[model samples]
Target chain A: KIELSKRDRLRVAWRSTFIQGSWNYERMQNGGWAFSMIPAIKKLYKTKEDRSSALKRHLEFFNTHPYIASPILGVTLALEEERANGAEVDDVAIQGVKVGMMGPLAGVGDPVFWFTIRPMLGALGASLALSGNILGPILFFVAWNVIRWGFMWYTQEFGYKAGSKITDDLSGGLLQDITKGASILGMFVLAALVQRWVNIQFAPIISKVKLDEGAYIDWSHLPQGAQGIKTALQQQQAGLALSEIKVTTLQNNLDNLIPGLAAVALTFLCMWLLKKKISPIIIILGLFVVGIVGHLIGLL
Target chain B: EKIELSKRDRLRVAWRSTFIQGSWNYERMQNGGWAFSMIPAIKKLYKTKEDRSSALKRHLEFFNTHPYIASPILGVTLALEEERANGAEVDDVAIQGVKVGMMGPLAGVGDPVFWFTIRPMLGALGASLALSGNILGPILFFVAWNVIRWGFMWYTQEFGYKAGSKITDDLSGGLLQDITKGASILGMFVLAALVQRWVNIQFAPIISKVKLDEGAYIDWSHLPQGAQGIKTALQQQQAGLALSEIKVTTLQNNLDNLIPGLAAVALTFLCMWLLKKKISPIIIILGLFVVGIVGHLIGLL
Candidate 1:
């Protein structure tokens, strides 16, 4: 029995925005959640008691990532539909489905939405902002919400429409394989990001020398500077004060060997500490101390 | 003899909690998915056809909770099944009741604790650190999240075993709210920190003009020529050498030197205060657009 009409589904989809609106420590998103399904419940359940019960159950205690709530809502609507049609769709089973779906959806939702997607988009926005472009914040905000709303709408619609295909796709170690693959993929992504992108350093600069007047370090046309400073230091005496030159970071020395050596090492150290089950906050605090103190002392 | 799982097996189930939605579907919802995650614990507990099948079918029934919160359910379920198998009169209804009840409330609990609080704080903090080129950014994020995550998982596992169906009472003792409240404060703090650092709003207008014989040019009349500060000390020091020229005069630098991230911070707090007053995020976003356009039109951002 298809209890939720197209208009009702759309209304429910619209209600997803208010999911976290009436949140509370006691019931989390319960009130708003109940409200989202209110449209469907009203139409689906003819009896006032039926509608009341459905509404009450949904409002009990519901929470998850806002976007991930759609699929759960889909399942809930389907179950309610079944119940309204006199099927043995017990409230326990309905609660079981709703609660069961949340934890897992949240597992994907947190990492993907909060950590990866937002940060990555924010980074791109920061890049534009760094370059003095007005489009940075505008584009980031637009792009993110587009994807967010698009995903929410599509998934909400798709899930509700396809609520009957509940065959178990997991079989013969497929779950195991996906789990392993996900772990491996996460590891690889981080490793790649670390080696290529992450940059950290506290190395000291040895000295600075000036280039010839009117001569710029044309990083391109500069006669292969690989050997230009073959004897970078032509020191006259121990106490001699040299003059006329430029200063560059030790990124030169470090970069010659590896792009971001210290940063990668620091990351590795933190991971090793993590493996020791050292609390991450402690690790963060320790790093802050080390980073700040070591830099101040210049003896790092 | 009775069926029981080893600690190692339970740990496997806990770890597999992250994959709670791999087979996410519309029909059974997370039944098969939940059942999938519970397989490790279930395999070790149930032995016969009726026992295993019914256990699977029982769990496959509408089941939903915060993924991390699922562990305790697993724990309670495991203990109950082992009790049932070992001749305890534990009924399926009792097990189902605990599972269903815990999910509803724990979901509410976990949302603020994990999503609104910890995740946002960690995410913003991590982004700030990472963008600043600190390796510890990613490390701190990944490690910190899992610590809370695994901590909860293992907690519920042991709690489930110890408290069984009474674990809900354990949660109702108000520790969850305390944790959730504490996280909200912390998340807001991080958001405050992020407000100044991350939000970008620069106003570079031709407030004054200089007319040359060849062509008229605009001078930064609003910001004094020397009023600018680059993000990094390296840029500041490097640009300080060319201190005499009007070239270093940008609104961004002046804003940085005067009170860095002032516009964004104020805007953020405004948005935040509105949220506290019950204005929705979507509305706030639309407000931002209005603010952005009006600010541009007014030649002040």
Candidate 2:
């Protein structure tokens, strides 16, 4: 590795905090990617062209969940260090690692970080705010940044150290095992998520029970004017199927019989349609139509 | 493909199947556990210490996979071990690769199937049954899940062994991708269903009550939710609260004539667009802080 000072690593970490300064769709995260690596780029590359090329390379269409980007960034830094020292590290190799890691890590990272952590923390903060606590927003900012900074800083070093470790680890043909393993886990989690997170509730049905069993009543001891009321009560108590064990709850009945049936059935139905090579965007659009219309029709 | 297996070993492997996580360090997850499960079978195959240790260590390197789906993996792995024992000259790396490679795709499949679909379905079924005061609820849940679990487990285990290396090909040939793709399409549909669900913000408060030229008091709570609900001091034109104006136009009544949830959607999409622009999340956050001081000043929250 080239002589990377402690300050250099610190600079990269600091710059990472600005990872999305000039965010755009055309190139995704290129702007922030370049900015974070610029400190190292300035120190390592001597010539003006080399620095510019380095900048351009870093500013390519790179995207990943921000936190997972750390190790990748770390690995990039290490590879660049090697390149600067006249080692035969091809540009594509560094780019390849970054691109490869970004996709899979994104598969894991996006759901875990954005859907999971961000919402939970922000909700915690919001709830606190709702309760009129000063710690609401204050606690949120601190809690979020603490983990964010720590992960970015520590993982970069990890990626830096892992610079030479991955291929060695993957070389024994274990790459496929890891891929297949991760794939199944993702699928497994997806099914569970569909059942758990996909919130689809139409107007729920009422739950009612029938009283078919006879009840004893002291009619002889009843008050003079309360005779009719007592007789009616006794008759209804022994009435045949007056109230059924289950009532009016299409959704509840289904749930009692088979939980998450609606979700699974819906998921599977969508899956079937999707398998027919349907455009996903259309399906997404159609969902709004079906949900709103069906709810209003009171048949959902 | 016939490999000798003791009943003791089979149950041992199956018993260990629960909580099958190992390879604690993130680098090689589940590797040690995979090795641990295979130890009984592996020792019988590779007799020499070096061979056995090599086999053990190979699995110990780094591995991960789901347990229920792992049964098939173990079966396939055991078959590979059996083949190796019979002196088929299988490169050690191939075994390692298959075991490792298969885990990822299988993990993707297993989780969605079990946690997402199967467990929830069964649990909900049980819960509902119990609601009706039936003991069959919990019983059905237990009996049904185990049936699926063990049935899938044993059948897949056998199939994996019988198929041998062919199983790897079938999996690697885009099955995983197709399933994941199918799932993605479904996921987006559910998300879009909730798009308009996030309600818009409306924090602009009722500033002033109605007043008469003679300064008669107006009860504010008696105002309706719509246009008649509020009376803005601004519409009084020369409005000073000297308690003498013919009418006050509530800014909210006029504002209510605008699109619903527009501000919320706009701000949300703005941040989303900003993110895609590679703008730092913090900047948008900084933008929000600016908006907050502004949200405080204007009350257009």
Candidate 3:
């Protein structure tokens, strides 16, 4: 089961797998799980009924376990073809067996596809691209397809070999373990992305200090010969180093933050009301009218 | 009957009613009736068969009236209480109070909150950011505004349940006055900041190429002081060009021609006109672009 591979090939396969996995996870979350697999299924089947049946079956599986449904879908398609022919087939027996096995498969698949495999590969690709490294695209493609094909191969073999026995309790335990591992990897990657990307800067607004002397103390002072500063001021009596005050380009006005927070809060409130069965269109329109009237009244 | 509405409830009802009124007003023009009435009809057509149907139906009926003009929840509550007490009676007075009392306050709140507080904040913030060449400022404003909308949606439902009729009473008394004043202050501050920060002005170039010396001479005579002296001398000599010969072109043409003399004249006149008319800065921007493009095309001074 464990196969040692070369560094370049491994890197490419790993990166690609990560990207494909993350995309799959995102698609599933957004109700596009079955849709994402339509092209792949279409390539394998020709007849309308076969395609239709396959789509329905996949949809059912996807609806139940969106993340891990892909492998079961592939395996079931193969089993479907085999059973379609005049063979000793027990539909209920096979389905019963699969029900148990697919649960574990789905469990392992969700975290692996969602958290660990996808993020690691995506991050590696992104890091390479950011650094202007040549291997970025290459790594994304190789890592992704290799894992996909690898999963396909193992799933097909496992489906045929285990058959009804695959639904045993042992499979479920294995899936749980693997899913936990994947979740840990996913969390780590998420934290890393947040740390690397989010950026914010804040600065002070007013810097004024008055001295007892009639002469206003030069608040706008700089160390002598400092770049972008006019002159350094020597305190007449104290001989102290008076630093030059520099105005910042960015405003740190606290008032601006209020509007931003208000907007966010209002939006959330609107959404919550809509969720409670209030009409959304009314809310939006009322906002516009209110806006116009407020303007006329010199309020807005 | 006059209903007692809490401050929170009034704000919520006002927001909800405003949203409803604004949304349905478009349909109302064509429908020739209050658009709010259609909500219950639409819900009736789509809702599934269930035990909740009766409750939903009753709620919808209450909503059918100018939901924007009245607090539906209070009306519904009153309706339910009346039904409980009389075992089938409906209170017209309670419903009337709900519809009439809520509409005016909703309009007042909607006008100030949506137009005054939110829109101006966004417009000012966006313009300031845009002036600085940061396009993200407008996008941030959009996101911020939408988030505010979503907040209103959630709070309105909660407020509807808790206060209902009482919300209107509270809003009219003193609840809204304080909030509106606070928002007005903030709006003024934003306007002040935008004026100080985003307004920009640059001086037009002066033209007078006369020289004081020959053989690679620097033209000191064309300088402002020199030009002034030259003007005085020319007036004394009666040698300066006549007003008719000056050929003062239109501002648009002067901008395109950019003949140093004409440009100075155009810039001065344009600034003066803009100040007099109180035109937005954006007009000056368009004028600048038009001049720039025309100048490039015509290949003229």
Interface RMSD of each: 19.3, 18.6, 16.2
Docking band of candidate 3: incorrect
- CA shift of A277, model 3, Å: 12
lDDT of 2 by residue, B19-113 (tens): 46744555676766777778778766767586877777776776677778888788788777777777677687877787777777677767766
TM-score of each model, in listed order: 0.35, 0.41, 0.29
User: In model 1, which regions exceed 4 Å deviation?
Assistant: A1-3, A25-27, A167-300, B1-301
Error of 1 at A169 (Å): 4.6
How would you encode candidate 1's per-residue C-alpha lDDT over A77-124 as one tens digit per residue? 766776767667677977777776676566656656765678789999
TM-score of 3: 0.29
**Residue by residue across A20-48, what tens digits does model 2's lDDT show?**
86888577788998999989998988769
Per-residue lDDT, model 3, residue B194, is: 46
Which residue window of length 10 is worst by lDDT in model 2 chain A?
A223-232
Model 1 lDDT, residue B120, Cα: 76
TM-score for candidate 2, please give it. Answer: 0.41
The digit string of per-residue lDDT tens for model 1 on B124-171 reads: 666655644567879999999989898988887877887765676777
Model 2 iRMS (Å) reads: 18.6
Stretches of candidate 3 exceeding 4 Å from the true structure = A1-70, A74-111, A126-132, A169-171, A187-300, B1-301
Q: What are the lDDT scores of the predictions, listed in order?
A: 0.69, 0.71, 0.48
